[PDB]
Design an enzyme around this catalytic site. Structure first.
Site, PDB file in Angstrom:
ATOM      1  N   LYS A  34       9.992  44.803  89.195  1.00  0.00           N
ATOM      2  CA  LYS A  34       8.891  43.853  89.361  1.00  0.00           C
ATOM      3  C   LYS A  34       7.616  44.366  88.686  1.00  0.00           C
ATOM      4  CE  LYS A  34       8.345  42.057  93.551  1.00  0.00           C
ATOM      5  NZ  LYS A  34       7.739  41.701  94.874  1.00  0.00           N
ATOM      6  N   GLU A  86      -1.715  43.707 100.170  1.00  0.00           N
ATOM      7  CA  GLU A  86      -1.261  44.958  99.538  1.00  0.00           C
ATOM      8  C   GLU A  86      -1.150  46.082 100.566  1.00  0.00           C
ATOM      9  OE1 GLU A  86      -0.026  46.796  95.734  1.00  0.00           O
ATOM     10  OE2 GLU A  86      -0.177  44.767  96.553  1.00  0.00           O
ATOM     11  N   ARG A  87      -0.044  46.794 100.530  1.00  0.00           N
ATOM     12  CA  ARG A  87       0.106  48.086 101.259  1.00  0.00           C
ATOM     13  C   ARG A  87      -0.644  49.193 100.523  1.00  0.00           C
ATOM     14  NH1 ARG A  87       4.793  45.674 100.534  1.00  0.00           N
ATOM     15  NH2 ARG A  87       5.855  44.767 102.348  1.00  0.00           N
TER      16      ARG A  87
HETATM   17  N1  LIG Z   1      12.748  47.555  81.659  1.00  0.00           N
HETATM   18  C1  LIG Z   1      13.170  48.722  82.204  1.00  0.00           C
HETATM   19  N2  LIG Z   1      13.763  49.695  81.459  1.00  0.00           N
HETATM   20  C2  LIG Z   1      14.191  50.869  81.973  1.00  0.00           C
HETATM   21  N3  LIG Z   1      14.063  51.160  83.280  1.00  0.00           N
HETATM   22  C3  LIG Z   1      13.489  50.277  84.153  1.00  0.00           C
HETATM   23  C4  LIG Z   1      13.007  48.980  83.650  1.00  0.00           C
HETATM   24  N4  LIG Z   1      12.503  48.326  84.701  1.00  0.00           N
HETATM   25  C5  LIG Z   1      12.645  49.122  85.793  1.00  0.00           C
HETATM   26  N5  LIG Z   1      13.231  50.284  85.463  1.00  0.00           N
HETATM   27  C6  LIG Z   1      13.569  51.419  86.365  1.00  0.00           C
HETATM   28  O1  LIG Z   1      13.669  51.042  87.752  1.00  0.00           O
HETATM   29  C7  LIG Z   1      12.678  51.720  88.535  1.00  0.00           C
HETATM   30  C8  LIG Z   1      12.168  50.816  89.646  1.00  0.00           C
HETATM   31  O2  LIG Z   1      11.461  49.699  89.088  1.00  0.00           O
HETATM   32  P1  LIG Z   1      10.071  49.142  89.676  1.00  0.00           P
HETATM   33  O3  LIG Z   1       9.294  48.483  88.564  1.00  0.00           O
HETATM   34  O4  LIG Z   1       9.416  50.228  90.506  1.00  0.00           O
HETATM   35  O5  LIG Z   1      10.578  47.961  90.660  1.00  0.00           O
HETATM   36  P2  LIG Z   1       9.713  47.389  91.912  1.00  0.00           P
HETATM   37  O6  LIG Z   1       8.362  46.973  91.370  1.00  0.00           O
HETATM   38  O7  LIG Z   1      10.623  46.288  92.417  1.00  0.00           O
HETATM   39  O8  LIG Z   1       9.553  48.556  92.845  1.00  0.00           O
HETATM   40  C9  LIG Z   1      11.618  52.131  87.522  1.00  0.00           C
HETATM   41  O9  LIG Z   1      10.778  53.172  88.030  1.00  0.00           O
HETATM   42  C10 LIG Z   1      12.483  52.473  86.313  1.00  0.00           C
HETATM   43  O10 LIG Z   1      13.160  53.730  86.393  1.00  0.00           O
END
Ligand SMILES: Nc1ncnc2c1ncn2[C@@H]1O[C@H](COP(=O)(O)OP(=O)(O)O)[C@@H](O)[C@H]1O
Ligand SMILES: Nc1ncnc2c1ncn2[C@@H]1O[C@H](COP(=O)(O)OP(=O)(O)O)[C@@H](O)[C@H]1O
Ligand SMILES: Nc1ncnc2c1ncn2[C@@H]1O[C@H](COP(=O)(O)OP(=O)(O)O)[C@@H](O)[C@H]1O
Ligand SMILES: [Mg+2]
Ligand SMILES: [Mg+2]
Lengths: 475, 461, 475
Positions: free
Chosen positions: B156, B182-183
Site C-alpha cells: 500500500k 493515523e496510528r
Molecule cells: N513494488 C514492490 N517491489 C518490491 N517489493 C515490494 C513492492 N511493494 C512492496 N514490496 C515489499 O513488501 C513490503 C511490505 O510492503 P508495504 O508497502 O509496507 O505494505 P503496507 O503499506 O500494506 O504495509 C515492502 O517493505 C517491500 O519489501
C-alpha cells in the site's frame, strides 16, 4: 414583517416573531439565503434553511415573502440548470418568468384522468418492446450502483428530440461532476433546448435534496395542465429518502424501519401520484415519471425499494451479473414489468413483441442446462439458438436510440428466424447492415410503420430481408 | 470577540457570548489553558440564550468554568502553498515534525462550499499513472475517487509513494496524505519511508491520530484537502489526495454526533452520514483550472458492503485498486488484482476503442486461466484443448508483464524503476494477445517496462 | 478551597453546588475523607464521581477542592506489590515507600519522539513468537470469547520475562478478586512476582476505579520507559473498563450511542494505548509494550468495542473455542490473527524458519478439505497434509511452560525441513521435548550461537545433530 433567530443547529432554526406567517411559507434570511416555515408554534416558528447556513446565527433576521413554497416555471427554464428553489447554477444570468407554481400541490383526482394509451418511446429496444412506457405512466428504474440507470434516462430524453415532449432531469444527491457530464451529453445530442435540469448535489444541505423532486414535479406539471406532455426523472429517490430521514431525525421524529420516519412512504406517494394522464376535459396533457431506486446487493425487498415498487405502474430492474457479462442494457426480464403494457405501444410493436418477455424469461431459465450441445433434444436446442440471437438484438450501445420503425423490423427479423443461419457473433453487425439497407432502399416499408403504426405486408417484408441477406458476408 | 465557558462535558464545551456577537457555525474558538497552551474548539450548535455548543480539537482536562474564549472570526485556518511541502501537520495546521514554523503566505479556512457548476470539467479525463496494471485495466480518472483495498504487507505505502513520485515526475503535480485515525507509530514509519524514497518533498502530510478526540479525526481530512485545493486552483496542478482511512472519518462523525445528542440513524450512524460525506467528497473534483484525484483506503465493517459507511462511500468512487497477497507472494509487484480491480472510465468513450478491446482481451485470458487452475493441478496439461494451452501460455506472460519495477523501490531492489505511458502499455499487451511474442521465455516479461525491454531481456537469457 | 455543597447523591454520583473555580478532572475531597473526581462542569452544578463508599455522603455534605489532577505513586517500590488504581497497597504488607509520583492522564510520545519497533518481546509461545511476533513498543490485542485462554497467554508472557530485565504490569479491571489472588500466586510460584506490579479494580469497586485502573498501570510502566528501561503492561480487560466508563457517562446523562456507549469511548482506549510506544535514541530508547484484552460475545469481533480496539492496536491474536476444544491449545487462529510490525520484531533465525512455517500452514488450511480422502490423493497433496498435521502439533504448547527463542527456532527448523516426516503424528510433541533436552545437554554450542548472534548456525552441523538424536528415538 420581520423575525429574529432564537436558536440554530444543523440547518434548522427557531425564529421569534413572524406572527402573521403561513404554514409552508417561503422566508428570506438577512444574507439572501432562503428558508421554509414548517412549524407554527405558540410564539415561535420552526424554520428549515434551504441553503448555506454558516452565516446564520442567533440574532439573524428573517423576512416573510408572503408566498407559499414555490418555484419559477415555464419556458424560461428550458435549457437551464437550476437548484430546487429555481435559482440558476449555470451562470447564464436570471430566469425571466412571470409564472410560478407551488411545490406542494394536489394530484389529479379520480375523475380528472384517462387510461394511459400513448407511447413514450425510450429508443431502447429492450424497454420499448418488453417494458413499454406510456404518457402519464410512472415506471421505476431500480438496480445496484453502476448497472446503467442514468444512461437509460439520458437516452430517453435524447430520443424525445422532435417528439414535442418537455423533459426534466432532477438530480438528487449525485456528484456534481456527473451532473455537469449529463448537461454536456444533452448539449451534444441537441436535447438540452427542451430539457430543464434541477440539481441538489451531494454537498447541499438535506432540505434541498428533500425538495428537489417536488420542484421538478411542479416544473413539469405546468406543461401537463396546459395540455402539453412532459417527462420527469428523479435520480434518485434513495438519496431523497435518506435526506428526509436526516431531517426527520434532526427534528427528533420517531424512527421506524431502517431509521426512516413513518411518513417516508407518503413522501414518495404524493410525489408520484402528481404524475398522470389527464382526461380530455382537463386538456389531455400528461406528466410521465421515471423515479430511480438504488438497491444494495440487488435487495429489492428492502424498505424503500418496496415502497416505491408499490407506488409505480411497473419497474425496470437492472442486474449486475447481466451488466458485467456484457448484456447492456442489463434488463432482468423475469422481475421487470409494465402494468400499462400493450396500451403504450404501436400495433406493430405489440404484434412482434407479444411473447418476447415470456420467451426470454424461459430462455434464461433453460440456459442453465445448455452444456449438452448436439446431445440435447432438438426442441430445446432451437430455443437456445433463437434465444442467444434475440439477446444480441436487445444489446444496445449507449447514447444510440433507435426509431420505433427500425426496432420493429429488427425484432421482426430475429423472431421470425431470419438470423437462425447467421453466426451469433455476426448478429449485431447483421442488424446494423440490415437497417442501413432498409433506410436507403426499402424506406416505403419503414414509412408505413411511422404513419399507420401497423406492420407492412408480411410477404413484402420477408422478401426485402431475404434480398438483403444475399449481399451479407458472414465470418 | 469574547466568551465565557459555562459547561465542560468531555470533548464538548458550551460557551456563552454577548448578545450581538455569536460566532458563525464551524468557527474556530481559542481558550488559553490555565496550565499553559491553547485549546482550539469548533462551534457546532447555537443553543439559545447566547450560548454555543462547541466540539473540542484536543483534551478538555484542566479547563475551568468562566475562562475566557476568543472567536477567531472564521473556520479553522491552515497553511497552504509550497511551505506545506515536506512538512507534517495536525488538524489545526500547526507543524508536528519539530522543524519550526511554516512561513506560508496564506492560511485558508478548512470549511468551504463545493466548486460551482460553472467551474466543472464536463468530460472524463484519464490520469496517467505510468503503472501498467492500473492504466490498462482499472485507470484512474482526474476528478475522481479511487478505493484502495489491501491488507498488511501487500504494498500500500510503496504504491502510494510511487503514485506521488509518478504524478510529480511527469505531470508535475503534488500530493497530500491525510492520516485519518493515523496510528502514531505508523505515521513515524511513513515519514521516514517517504524521506528515504525522496517523495517527501513532493508531499504535504496531515495526521489526526488515534489518540486525538473525535473532532480532530472528523476534520483532519479537510485540512489535507484544503492544501490540495490550493495546488489545483492556484497552480493549475493535477493533485493526489491520499486518505487512510476514510471510514475513520465517517466513524469520527458518528462519535461527534453522539456527543451533540443527535438521534442515531440506521446501524447507529449519525443522521448526517450522507451529507458529511458529500461535503468532503464533492470538493475532491476536477475543475477547469486542474484536478484533485483522491485515493482512499476504506474499512468495511463486518465484511458487509451494504453497511451505511461503505455504501455511502461507494457512491462517490470512480475506481478500485484491489491489492491481493496471493500475487505479492508470487513476486508480482505491484500486487494489483487484474480481475477484481475496476474503473468506471474503462470504456471506449474515454480511453480509446483499442485500449478497451485490449484490456477486455487481457481479462478474458486471465479469467480463463483462473478457471483452469484447478483442472490443471489435477488432470495436468494434456487434458486442455489446443486453444486453452495457448491461452495459458499467454496468460502467464500477461501476468508477468503486469509486474513492474518501481522508482521508490530503487533502493531496495537495486534495479531502476520504470514509467510506462498508456500508449506503450496498450501496445505491449496488444502484441502479446496477437501472438507476436509467443516464443520469448516467460522470465523475459517479468519486471520490465515497455514491450521493447522484454525483447531486450530475452537476449540476456 | 472555597468549598461546595452536595445538592443530590445516588449510585456513586454527586451533583455539587459551588466549587466555581474547579478544573475538569480535578480531585475533590468530601467532608468525611472520601475522594471524588470532577467530571461534568455544568451551568449550575458540578458532576462528581465518587471514588469510595458513598452512603455517608448526603444532601448538604461539603466538598473541598484539592487543586490537583489525579496522580499515582510510581517506581521500584511497587515491584512485587498488589495495589489499587490510587496506588494503595491491598496485599496488607504495609506502605509503599516511594518519593516519586506521576499523573494518570499524560500526553503520548509524539511522532518525532519514537523509533520503529525493532526489538523482540518474546512471549515464549511458539504460535505467537513465530507467526504473530510482538516487539518492544508494540500494542497487540488479545481477543476472544470467555475461556479461550487469554489470561494464560499474558501470565505465560510475564513469566518468560524472568531475567530479561523487563518490568511487567498486570492490570485487572472488573475481575473477581479471588481470581486476581490466584494470578499473583501463580506468578509467585514461577518466580515472576518480584519484577511485576499488580493493579486491581475488582468487580465490587466503584465504576470510576475500573475506569482509572488501566491509566494507573500505564503511568507505572511509563516511569520505566522514560528512564530508558523496558516495560510490559496488560489490561485484562478493556471490555469491563468501557462498561464502567459507560455506567459513569450514563449517570452523568451524557448522550448514548451504539450499545449505549458514549461518543468518546473510542477516545478512552486510543489515549491509553498510544501512550505505549518505542522511544527514539535521543529520548532514551526505552519502551512500553501493551497487551490489551477484549472479551467477545459468541465470537462477534464486529461489535462496537472490539472493532474500536482492533482499529487502535498494531495487530491482534484471536482465540477460538472450536480450536480450544479440538485440542489446539493455545487456541490461536493463525490465519486471521496479525502482527503489523512483523519480522522487524523477530531475531533473524526465527524470521528465516517461520517464513516456511507460514507457507506450510497456508497450504495445509487450503488442502484441509481433502483430509478425509487419505491415500486417494496424489503424493504431492498427501505430503502437504502430513507436514501440516505435524507443524500443528509443534504449535500446541503446555500451559505455564514458556520456551526460549533459541529452542523454538530449532524445533520449528526441525519440522519445517522434514525431520519429523518419518515420525507418527501422535509422537511429534514428545519428539520435540526429547530433542530439546538432547540439544541442551549435548549440543549447547549450537543453541548458544543463536542466543549470541541471533542467526541460524551452520545448517550442515545442525542437520547432523538432529539426525544424531533421531537414531536414539523410539516410537
Ligand atoms: N513494488 C514492490 N517491489 C518490491 N517489493 C515490494 C513492492 N511493494 C512492496 N514490496 C515489499 O513488501 C513490503 C511490505 O510492503 P508495504 O508497502 O509496507 O505494505 P503496507 O503499506 O500494506 O504495509 C515492502 O517493505 C517491500 O519489501
Ligand atoms: N448500454 C450501454 N453500453 C455501454 N456502456 C454503458 C451502457 N449503459 C451504461 N454504460 C456505462 O456504465 C456506466 C454506469 O452507467 P450509469 O447509467 O451511470 O449507471 P448508474 O446510473 O446506475 O450508476 C457508465 O459510465 C456508462 O458509461
Ligand atoms: N495452553 C493451554 N493448555 C491447556 N490448558 C489451558 C491452556 N491455556 C489455558 N488453559 C486452561 O483453560 C482455561 C482458560 O482460562 P484463561 O487462561 O483464564 O482464559 P480466559 O482468560 O480467556 O478465560 C483455564 O482453566 C486454564 O487452566
Ligand atoms: Mg447514475
Ligand atoms: Mg481471563
Amino acid at each position: 414583517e420581520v423575525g429574529t433567530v432564537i436558536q440554530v443547529g444543523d440547518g434548522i432554526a427557531r425564529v421569534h416573531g413572524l406572527e402573521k406567517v403561513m404554514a409552508g411559507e417561503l422566508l428570506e434570511f438577512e444574507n439572501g439565503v432562503m428558508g421554509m416555515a414548517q412549524n407554527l408554534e405558540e410564539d415561535n416558528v420552526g424554520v428549515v434553511i434551504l441553503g448555506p447556513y454558516t452565516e446564520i446565527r442567533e440574532g439573524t433576521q428573517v423576512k416573510r415573502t408572503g408566498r407559499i413554497m414555490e418555484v419559477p416555471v415555464g419556458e424560461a427554464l428550458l435549457g437551464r440548470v437550476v437548484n430546487p428553489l429555481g435559482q440558476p447554477l449555470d451562470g447564464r444570468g436570471p430566469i425571466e418568468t412571470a409564472e410560478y407554481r407551488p411545490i406542494e400541490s394536489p394530484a389529479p383526482g379520480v375523475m380528472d384522468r384517462k387510461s394511459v394509451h400513448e407511447p413514450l418511446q425510450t429508443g431502447i429496444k429492450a424497454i420499448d418492446s418488453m417494458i413499454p412506457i406510456g404518457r402519464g405512466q410512472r415506471e421505476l428504474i431500480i438496480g445496484d450502483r453502476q448497472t446503467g440507470k442514468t444512461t437509460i434516462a439520458i437516452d430517453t430524453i435524447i430520443n424525445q428530440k422532435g417528439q414535442d415532449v418537455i423533459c426534466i432531469y432532477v438530480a438528487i444527491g449525485q456528484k456534481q461532476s456527473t451532473v455537469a457530464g449529463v448537461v454536456e451529453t444533452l448539449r451534444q445530442h441537441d436535447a438540452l433546448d427542451y430539457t430543464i435540469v434541477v440539481t441538489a448535489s451531494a454537498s447541499e444541505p438535506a432540505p434541498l435534496l428533500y425538495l428537489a423532486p417536488y420542484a421538478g414535479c411542479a416544473m413539469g406539471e405546468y406543461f401537463m395542465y396546459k395540455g402539453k406532455h412532459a417527462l420527469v426523472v428523479y435520480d434518485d429517490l434513495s438519496k431523497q429518502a435518506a435526506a428526509y430521514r436526516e431531517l426527520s431525525l434532526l427534528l427528533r421524529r420517531p424512527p421506524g424501519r431502517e431509521a426512516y420516519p413513518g411518513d417516508v412512504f407518503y413522501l414518495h406517494s404524493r410525489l408520484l401520484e402528481r404524475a398522470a394522464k389527464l382526461s380530455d376535459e382537463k386538456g389531455g396533457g400528461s406528466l410521465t415519471a421515471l423515479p430511480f431506486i438504488e438497491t444494495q446487493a440487488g435487495d429489492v425487498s428492502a424498505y424503500i425499494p418496496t415502497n416505491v415498487i408499490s407506488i409505480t405502474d411497473g419497474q425496470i430492474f437492472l442486474e449486475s451479473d447481466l451488466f458485467y457479462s456484457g448484456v447492456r442494457p442489463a434488463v432482468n426480464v423475469g422481475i421487470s414489468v409494465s402494468r400499462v403494457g400493450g396500451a403504450a405501444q404501436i400495433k406493430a410493436m405489440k404484434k412482434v413483441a407479444g411473447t418476447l418477455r415470456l420467451d426470454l424469461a424461459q430462455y434464461r431459465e433453460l440456459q442453465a442446462f445448455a452444456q449438452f450441445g448436439s446431445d440435447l433434444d432438438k426442441a430445446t436446442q432451437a430455443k437456445l439458438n433463437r434465444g442467444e440471437r434475440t439477446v444480441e438484438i436487445l444489446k444496445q450501445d449507449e447514447h444510440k436510440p433507435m426509431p420505433v420503425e427500425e426496432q420493429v423490423i429488427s425484432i421482426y427479423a430475429v423472431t421470425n428466424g431470419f438470423m437462425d443461419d447467421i453466426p451469433v457473433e455476426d448478429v449485431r453487425r447483421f442488424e446494423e447492415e440490415l437497417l442501413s439497407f432498409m433506410r436507403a432502399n426499402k424506406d416505403s416499408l419503414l414509412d408505413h410503420i411511422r404513419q399507420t403504426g401497423e406492420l407492412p405486408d408480411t410477404k413484402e417484408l420477408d422478401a426485402a430481408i431475404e434480398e438483403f441477406k444475399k449481399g451479407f458476408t458472414p465470418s | 470577540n469574547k466568551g465565557r465557558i459555562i459547561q465542560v462535558m468531555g470533548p464538548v464545551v458550551d460557551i456563552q457570548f454577548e448578545s450581538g456577537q455569536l460566532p458563525d457555525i464551524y468557527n474556530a474558538i481559542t481558550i488559553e489553558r490555565p496550565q499553559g497552551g491553547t485549546l482550539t474548539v469548533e462551534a457546532a450548535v447555537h443553543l439559545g440564550d447566547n450560548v454555543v455548543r462547541c466540539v473540542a480539537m484536543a483534551s478538555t482536562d484542566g479547563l475551568v468554568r468562566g475562562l475566557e474564549a476568543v472567536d477567531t472570526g472564521a473556520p479553522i485556518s491552515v497553511p497552504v502553498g509550497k511551505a506545506t511541502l515536506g512538512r507534517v501537520f495536525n488538524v489545526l495546521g500547526e507543524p508536528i515534525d519539530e522543524q519550526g514554523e511554516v512561513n506560508a503566505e496564506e492560511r485558508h479556512p478548512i470549511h468551504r462550499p463545493a466548486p460551482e457548476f460553472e467551474e466543472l470539467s464536463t468530460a472524463d479525463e484519464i490520469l496517467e499513472t505510468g503503472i501498467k496494471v492500473i492504466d490498462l485495466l482499472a485507470p484512474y480518472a482526474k476528478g475522481g475517487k479511487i478505493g484502495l483495498f489491501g491488507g498488511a504487507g501487500v504494498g500500500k505505502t510503496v504504491l502510494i509513494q510511487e503514485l506521488i513520485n509518478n504524478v510529480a515526475q511527469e505531470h508535475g503535480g503534488l500530493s497530500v496524505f491525510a492520516g485519518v485515525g493515523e496510528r502514531t507509530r505508523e505515521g513515524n514509519d511513513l515519514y521516514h519511508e517517504m524521506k528515504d524514497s525522496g517523495v517527501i518533498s513532493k508531499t504535504s502530510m496531515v495526521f489526526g491520530q488515534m489518540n486525538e478526540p473525535p473532532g480532530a479525526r472528523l476534520r483532519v481530512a479537510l485540512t489535507g484537502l484544503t492544501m490540495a485545493e490550493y495546488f489545483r486552483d492556484r497552480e493549475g496542478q493535477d493533485v493526489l489526495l491520499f486518505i487512510d482511512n476514510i471510514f475513520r472519518f465517517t466513524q469520527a462523525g458518528s462519535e461527534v454526533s453522539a456527543l451533540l445528542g443527535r438521534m442515531p440513524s440506521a446501524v447507529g450512524y449519525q443522521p448526517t452520514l450522507a451529507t458529511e460525506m458529500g461535503q468532503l467528497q464533492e470538493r475532491i473534483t476536477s475543475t477547469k483550472k486542474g484536478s484533485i484525484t483522491s485515493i482512499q483506503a476504506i474499512y468495511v465493517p463486518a465484511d458487509d458492503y451494504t453497511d451505511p459507511a461503505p455504501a455511502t462511500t461507494f457512491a462517490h468512487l470512480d475506481a478500485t485498486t484491489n491489492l491481493e497477497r496471493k500475487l505479492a507472494e508470487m513476486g508480482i509487484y505491484p500486487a494489483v488484482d487484474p480481475l477484481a480491480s475496476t474503473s468506471r472510465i474503462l470504456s471506449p468513450a474515454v480511453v480509446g476503442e483499442e485500449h478497451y478491446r485490449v484490456a477486455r482481451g487481457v481479462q478474458q485470458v486471465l479469467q480463463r486461466y483462473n478457471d483452469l487452475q484447478d483442472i490443471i493441478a489435477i488432470l495436468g496439461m494434456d487434458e486442455l484443448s489446443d486453444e486453452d494451452k495457448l491461452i495459458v501460455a499467454r496468460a502467464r506472460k500477461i501476468q508477468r508483464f503486469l509486474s513492474q519495477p518501481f522508482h521508490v523501490a530503487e533502493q531496495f531492489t537495486g534495479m531502476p524503476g520504470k514509467y510506462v505511458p498508456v500508449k506503450e502499455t496498450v501496445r505491449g499487451f496488444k502484441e502479446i494477445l496477437e501472438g507476436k511474442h509467443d516464443n520469448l521465455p516467460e522470465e523475459a516479461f517479468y519486471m520490465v517496462g515497455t514491450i521493447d525491454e522484454a525483447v531486450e531481456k530475452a537476449k540476456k537469457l
